[PDB]
Amino acid sequence: EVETFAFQAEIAQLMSLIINTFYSNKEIFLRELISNSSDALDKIRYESLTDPSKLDSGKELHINLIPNKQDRTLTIVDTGIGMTKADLINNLGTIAKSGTKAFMEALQAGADISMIGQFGVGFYSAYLVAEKVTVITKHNDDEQYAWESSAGGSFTVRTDTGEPMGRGTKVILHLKEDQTEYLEERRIKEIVKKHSQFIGYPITLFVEK
Ligand SMILES: NS(=O)(=O)c1ccc(Cl)s1
């Protein structure tokens, strides 16, 4: 059972701007998704401060980066608060309509795409490097779901029958043919050291073969 949804017009406009605008500094996608993961980990930690059972689904709070050259995917895993089905449909838990509005007025006022994160819609910078994005998520109050979109105006949501997560969010980036540099160990390490050196959670870069 797979449900298909239309993006709100403003969000469709944002993703086409990200996909079509010439902008060479694509590496900021990773900073934005790691920062999103850190925000989600902050939220489950705060909730657990007054109710420890919120961590029965997983005590460890961390971020993993998993490149896979065979599948040409880069996956960002965190054990944060996760997302409900309603959250996924609701622009992945963001205020994306008002955020896109403020972002686009900022761009005509001197901004560039790199401050997308200041407007709450940093997730969509994933489409600087990915032709398709899959999001697997598990929230304590809901079941495990999978979100997917290749842009073009629509996204899908289905119950995920894959590997159980426990709690958190998995962003799978199906990389464009000319963006495979972000599967290289020394290139990921350079970006994490440049942009994410102060994230308050352990970031583990997996190796291959
Ligand atoms: N869409 S979002 O809520 O910024 C987000 C992307 C990845 C997460 Cl973990 S949370």
Ligand SMILES: NS(=O)(=O)c1ccc(Cl)s1
């Ligand atoms: N260690 S983990 O983040 O659960 C993971 C290992 C392999 C994946 Cl694919 S996801």
